């Protein structure tokens, strides 16, 4: 038995995780209205996508990984002598990478696939991927694996905000709020991106993030913070600063960045605070 995990590219696991555990990424990818298409990587800067949706009279289109990009990696993994593969997936409710994750698995043979449902995005995501390595050092075998990150979902989610709406109602990604359609103060739930409180001001949207996240995760027995931020990159800092002011070094608080299959949905100033009841190692 040769556990492997790998991921999507919507997990957005630095560099250094990714070449220190060898991670196999199913790229997703955008596509601009001038026809310029994008996989996503950590070789393109983010604030070029920044400014190119910017510079765009059209909402960009993103997509999943095709079907046949999950099978090429399975078939790559199980030809390097690995057994069983822990998949780590978009959100289901917001992207059908996870369901063809799924059916690929289905497909492809002489290994076995374990395709995970998130039921999130970006590094919130990729905590499932650094939890499932460290369980495969530690010796469990798939099934444990997937039963922890079941039980880890349950104590895992996310609030966000973002500047406008356009962007999430345009692509549908957004549950409801159509009356909304001041600053929204969104959140995950079940996998899908519902209204949470509509606050007068952006600083007290941030505010009220903090204050959501952390009337929760303080009765979690271990705590990872992440801050996910957009393209005002003051707005991720001010948040990530404060938040190691406000909270314990019993919290572990961490920071990342949105990738463009991400901010193509989000649109302008999409800011998270997501969090985990698990201290997730992540060297
Ligand atoms: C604090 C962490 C939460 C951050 C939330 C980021 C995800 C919001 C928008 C997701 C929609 C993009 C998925 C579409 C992919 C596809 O085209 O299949």
């Known amino acids: 038995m040769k556990i492997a995990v790998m991921t999507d590219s919507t997990s957005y696991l630095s560099q250094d995780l990714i070449d220190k555990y060898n991670i196999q990424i199913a790229p997703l990818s955008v596509t601009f209205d001038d026809g310029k298409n994008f996989t996503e990587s950590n070789e393109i800067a983010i604030e070029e996508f920044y400014n190119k949706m910017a510079s765009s009279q059209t909402i960009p289109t993103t997509s999943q990984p095709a079907i046949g990009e999950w099978i090429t990696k399975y078939e790559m993994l199980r030809d390097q ?21 799924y059916q690929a698995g289905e497909m492809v043979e002489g290994v076995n696939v374990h395709a995970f449902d998130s039921k ?8 499932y991927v650094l939890r499932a390595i460290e369980m495969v050092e530690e010796g469990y075998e798939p099934q444990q694996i997937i039963d922890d990150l079941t039980n880890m979902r349950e104590h895992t989610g996310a609030y966000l905000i973002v500047d406008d709406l356009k962007n999430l109602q345009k692509s549908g990604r957004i549950t409801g709020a159509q009356a909304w359609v001041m600053k929204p103060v969104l959140k995950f739930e079940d996998g899908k991106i519902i209204p949470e409180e509509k606050v007068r001001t952006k600083k007290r949207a941030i505010q009220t993030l903090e204050k959501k996240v952390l009337d929760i995760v303080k009765d979690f027995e271990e705590v990872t913070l992440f801050v996910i931020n957009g ?9 990530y600063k404060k938040l ?10 961490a920071y990342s960045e949105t990738g463009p299959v991400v901010a193509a949905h989000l649109g302008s100033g999409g800011l998270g605070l997501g969090y985990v009841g698990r201290k997730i190692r992540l060297t």
């Open 81 to 101: 002598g690995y057994t069983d593969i822990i998949v780590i997936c978009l959100s289901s409710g917001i992207s059908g990478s996870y369901q063809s994750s």
């Open 120 to 127: 999130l995005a970006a590094m919130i995501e990729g905590c």
């Open 231 to 239: 393209d005002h990159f003051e707005d991720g800092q001010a948040l």
């Open 244 to 253: 190691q002011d406000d909270c314990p070094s019993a919290y572990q608080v």
